């Protein structure tokens, strides 16, 4: 009967913002309010309005009205510095624009929703506005600003601008109901694309008494007392006020695939006109019950089942019983004497806001559904004698009340009718939990592992560490709020949270260009660093800078003399991303040389040396290569992403995965090809052309000068400007390490009977390349440089170049990594990321910068020997963060109770602060 | 690649309204303006501004300014009577809601949609405005009537409240784009229900000069010489301009269905943001691609074979290269050299129109669509230097040139957009071919009829009627257009007109409360009568009314005594729903009795007395049954409906059947059984028990005192109030006769040889209540005057009263005819109509009626005895028409070519005609 003609989704709505009177800023304020009973009509300040009076025809005129509603405390400040708006920009901007920026940043905030995130996506913005009062200030002389500031399309326009949103911008107007009509078309866009979040809402504003004025030369409109009485005995008229609302809509979907909280959903909306009525601003009962039956139809509900009913209400002898007839005919036919439906109106409270009401309609139904309390509405001194209540199948709720819920559920409606004849009807319901939801000797070694961490977390458990993000457009802005984020955790409140809880909150928050992160424990720790920080102290546990850097980050894949006893063990145990990646890799090293390297991994005896038989030079390289794969992934599940790459010797492999020329598999032929061939290689000849290599403190230029004398020399790494590591027969280097010693510049030896790049890779070539056929190199799409090809910056979208003879060459010949990392700084790369067990790579790097004119470069190390492998995994995607690179930081704190213990998780942190100054446009008359 | 996702239908245009500058007021003569190139920028009327004007501050600033661009010649004026607004109210309406009016109604009168035919409909609005500035005037000192005339909201409302509009009614304002942003949300509506018509468009007024001074102070955007140079190198900034236009916009398969002729075809369109661009003002090429790409994705449409683009053309140096870069990205690649999309816009000829641009741009190609033309761009002396329109696949049409259609048919694409970012794109195509699609014996005298009627047509073929309907809303309105009407035919123009064209035209029009109809074979005729309609003279001809009646009409079944050699004979060869129905109750009747009446209807030499062998008595009844059916759904099948009904002891079957009581086959088996038992009993007894019935002019009262004397006489029929039929035995009917004649009376016989209502039919009653089992009687549905219960009235939805025992007690007993007419008349009914052959009973009407005194009731008398059967049923439906009652004038002229000879049909009759008067708001400042 009343079943969806239309296969469509149901909306929901996850964030309200509130600027209403009585300093009702904030939706917890106007619930309590609500509850409380709270008039909040009030005389008119004495500082309004004073641009016309000081005339004595038109201040009497205005004395004589009744000039008694709802005032905003402070209209005129507002912080042009945050909104990036000049003096005199700012004084010439109707305060229903500077509402509307407000309403929007708090909306997103109460919704958990960063708004840096939403910058480039398709969200829209419908807002209603029927008066441009502020545009009379203007032209009582003015100023070309005052175009685009009082302008009705700029309300929403530049709400769009800058929060850089591209969906639809339009700012809608049909009189006393153009809140509810932006959210109608909201919803229908949802449904039928066109957008994937919308802010619907209202704003109004008194800057003059010309409108209010003429309501009272009409008489019998204006209430003489100002308050309203909606169905009631006594009602006399309304009062008009000011104030404004938004919502975040989104589909239900959507929200429930994004972890958002759901307040309320909004099943179904309707609008119609009034037609030829007995007048214009003659309200038509009988169109009236088309639009309720028209919404409900939509919203596939039967109105019998409606529990309340949010009325138009304004407190008009005559108007109130015509909206309790149609509401008879269609919401109460067939419901039984003792089931009627409970009506209120929020304008009792707030007053008349008229293209704001429906605004805060919604907002007092939305909190309302997610508790589970009605308000009452007060001025209510007896039911009207026009109206029979009993045989309409209603009741004014006049005191606080639970749902009924007839229908097992909780259901509601808003209706806001126009003077001009537009009406409108949203049904809205509560959130349902439906809506909630849609290797052998390896695994004997995990097992111990597992057992053994268990056991040893119950001697001493663990403090897990919690990055507290902190950021803002100013460094200013940043430590400020810092210093109210530690008074408040220091607080009872405060020391109630887990601490995860808070960092939750925080990931979820606008992530502005100055960042900062705290890395604590406890909250002691966590206020100790914010207190720090709310000054210049710098802190170890505290990570901050004033603003991004330039160009993206480069990943350094090195991975050699980078392993330990256990290496890759702890985040193996107590990471799923970095597990499943590592046994991926596993399972195709299983395939080509038919063992598993976990039995190596979780293995604690085994130290890659003496106690690995299978040829420990060609397991160590396959482990620090799974290894970097698995950090890499990791980085990207967090939302890192790499601007350029670059390799040493044995990443070139990983690196060419990571920019993209090879696939996961055929890297790992190569990779597995060249270790394999080099354990057995060493293997196969030794004492007569063995021959080891060792680094020594010279420089390219002095390589060439000195090599005349040694002929066979060769060299390997140019590891860094004034070092270098080359290789030859033990009596070559041993003269080299004497000569070098002789000038007191420092060698070594690297202890390590392979050799690579070098004679001996010569006879493996043939059997190599033989190997490595069937690969598929494939366009870059990242930035490469190319140590093998003298370190060449290679664009993204350039033609394959890992084809076999680039491994042969790579093997065979040196790597230019000290050229490559100085064609980077030249770029402007200043940013390094090194992913290996340890990081050596990164003093070389550091030397390189150094020389290059670069003292400021961001060194950022993974995982390193002798330090948890968790909590430095952490550290580095902070600095990221802190630098401005790519990072989805709201991915470190996924939520573990979504739809049952909600409130343990996201913490009452403190909110956004602004500094409001007073901009106002003076005028005489 | 580019199919629709989602599937939607296509919307079609149907109306266009214009008020462009440059006395643009109808698409006509804006199609021949945009061919000649014309430029519609002019200086600044003298009698314009004036009221800021005599200040020498001002005047002095505005002089300075540019102060050129296109205004509207009458922007005062205003027809307050016919739109019921008082000449204080008048004063305070801003022109754009004047113009929304005024152009809603010629759109409709263009699409040839009746505006009554809309009302209570779900019709939306969506208008866009931008600029509120009728309001300055108001504020310069006021009345309150200022408020709802200024409001942007009331722009649509008052359209939905003059015309009684029950769909949305809400403003948007996107600022420069409101125009096509009003399109898409009709155009999405329509896809989404919510509305079956939509009306789009949007309206500016120049009316103060601070927007225009504003942007002068600004400095380079307003061009020194007020005309702009779209797409050319000689660019320097752009004009403002005034105006307003409207389109009628249905789901295509509603205007195939009504007839409706299709302009152009509307396959998508979509809106975006430009976000965070170089400023708020500044565009961004890379939104303008994505809603390209958004709205031909919805269109199903690729971008490639589009043949013009009416691109935004704002004549800036800096804005119109940008217009360009999105094209060539989207619209402009993989095309051939060869095939450029054609470019233009409409703003080189009319000027800037803020939130009026895209109704002009969307008229212009909509009349190109329609065309086969593409006007050109003027302004144009060489191509922008920075922009390469070759490499873009870009070209200026300059002049007059044909559709290249490279997919084979015509593709068109407006954009628009707005100074604060938001953006617009509507795509269009032409109206393809494709859219436009989704009794043995009986036989022979039917054959010999159609030869014999066809071969009389050849030596002189008849002249149709053709019922031209005049109306307004005045008497006076009304005659001045018939004089204007004929004017028109007179002129050679009418001269070649079918005369069909004109009616089928006419009864497309807005039916008023004041009507008249003309009834004319040829043009001189309808002339005659028309000039004779522009006064007060009456004439044969014409059918004329000063307004509608208060109750619906009453249906009058007797078919008593209106039998006659041929009729329904020429009804039903040259009529299908009348034969329809015919051979229905033919068939029916077959299966009671077992023969067919069409053997008797088509047969010539039956005259239903001596030529029948089958009891003349029994088929007269069932003839005339049938007769009456066929008349009542042929009224039907145009629209008239019963407000009540009324028999005469012949017709209550088939009143029956009207009102709803008893079906078809029940009614058909009542009248078979009554006149098969009454011919069989008739024969079965002669001479011993014969009774026959006669006429006597007494009354109720004198009846009851002269049957004192005559014991066995009874009363049959009380037709009316001094007459009365009776029934008896010769000898006591003699006496009567010569008893009346002694007194003066008049009387007659009847020469009936059945007798009904009598004692006769007593043993009837036994047999015919056993072949009456099985009916259903149901609720009436419609008002009854039984005239067997005392002619008492019986409402609407009341139970069931044609039991078995209903039929008997009116063959038996008596009718009471004249007592049910005047209550009726008690009720208020004034107008009768009579379903027979011949009328009859409208004479024993008449005479109750006046004895009741109504004098002037409407007595509408169908078929009739030598009077063509045709020209007396168009009659009767004109008469309904001219005195209010429900019918569809559409009905009568059915569309015979559509899509293939349009040209000729729907002449080109005047339009209709506004008296305009001064309506303006002083001011002094």
Known sequence: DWSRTRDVEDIAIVGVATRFPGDLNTPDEMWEALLEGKDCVTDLPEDRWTEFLDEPRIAERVKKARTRGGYLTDIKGFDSEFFALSKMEADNIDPQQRMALELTWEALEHARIPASSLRGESVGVYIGSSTNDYSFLAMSDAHPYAITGTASSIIANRVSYFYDFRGPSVAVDTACSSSLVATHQGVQALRAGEADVAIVGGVNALVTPLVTVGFDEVGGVLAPDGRIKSFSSDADGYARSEGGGMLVLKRISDARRDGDQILAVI???AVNHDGRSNGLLAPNPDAQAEVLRKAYKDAGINPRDVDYIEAHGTGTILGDPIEADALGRIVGKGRPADKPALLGAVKSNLGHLESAAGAASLAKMTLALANDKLPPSINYAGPNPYIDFEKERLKVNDTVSDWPRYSGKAIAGVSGFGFGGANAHVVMREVLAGDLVETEAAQRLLEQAREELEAKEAEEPTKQLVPLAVSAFLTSRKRQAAAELADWIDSPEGRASSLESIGRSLSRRNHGRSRAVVLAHDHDEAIKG??????????????????????????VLAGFGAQHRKMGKSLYLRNEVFAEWINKVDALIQDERGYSILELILDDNVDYTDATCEYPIEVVQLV????????????????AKPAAVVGQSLGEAAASYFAGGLSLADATRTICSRSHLMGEGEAMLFGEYIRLMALVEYSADEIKTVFSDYPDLEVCVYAAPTQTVIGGPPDQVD????????????????????????????????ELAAELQGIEPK???????????????????????????????????????????RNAVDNGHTTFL??????VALMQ????????????????????????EVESMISAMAQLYVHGHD????????????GLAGALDFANIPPTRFKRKEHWLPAHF
Chains 1, 2 share one sequence.
Do not use: C
């Not at 993204?796 to 490559?820: E, M, N």
């Not at 990072?887 to 979504?898: E, G, I």
């Open 267 to 269: 099943a179904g909306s």
């Open 530 to 555: 914010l207190r720090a920080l709310a000054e210049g102290k710098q802190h170890p546990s505290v990570l901050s800078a004033d603003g991004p850097v330039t160009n993206g980050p480069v990943w």
């Open 624 to 639: 620090i290569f799974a290894i970097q794969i698995a950090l890499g992934e990791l980085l990207r599940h967090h939302g």
């Open 735 to 766: 003269a080299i390490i004497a000569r070098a010693e002789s000038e007191g510049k420092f060698a070594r030896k690297f202890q390590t009977k392979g050799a690579s790049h070098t004679q001996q890779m010569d006879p493996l070539l043939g």
């Open 779 to 821: 366009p870059l799409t990242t930035g490469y440089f190319s140590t093998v090809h003298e370190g060449t910056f290679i664009r993204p979208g350039s033609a394959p170049i890992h084809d076999v003879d680039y491994w042969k060459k790579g093997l065979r010949h040196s790597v230019y990594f000290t050229q490559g990392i």
């Open 834 to 839: 090194e992913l290996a067990p340890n990081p």
């Open 845 to 868: 790097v550091g030397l390189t910068t150094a020389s290059a004119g670069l003292h400021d470069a961001q060194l950022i190390a993974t995982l390193a020997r002798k330090q948890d």
């Open 887 to 898: 990072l989805d930081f709201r991915t470190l704190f996924p939520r573990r109770s979504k």
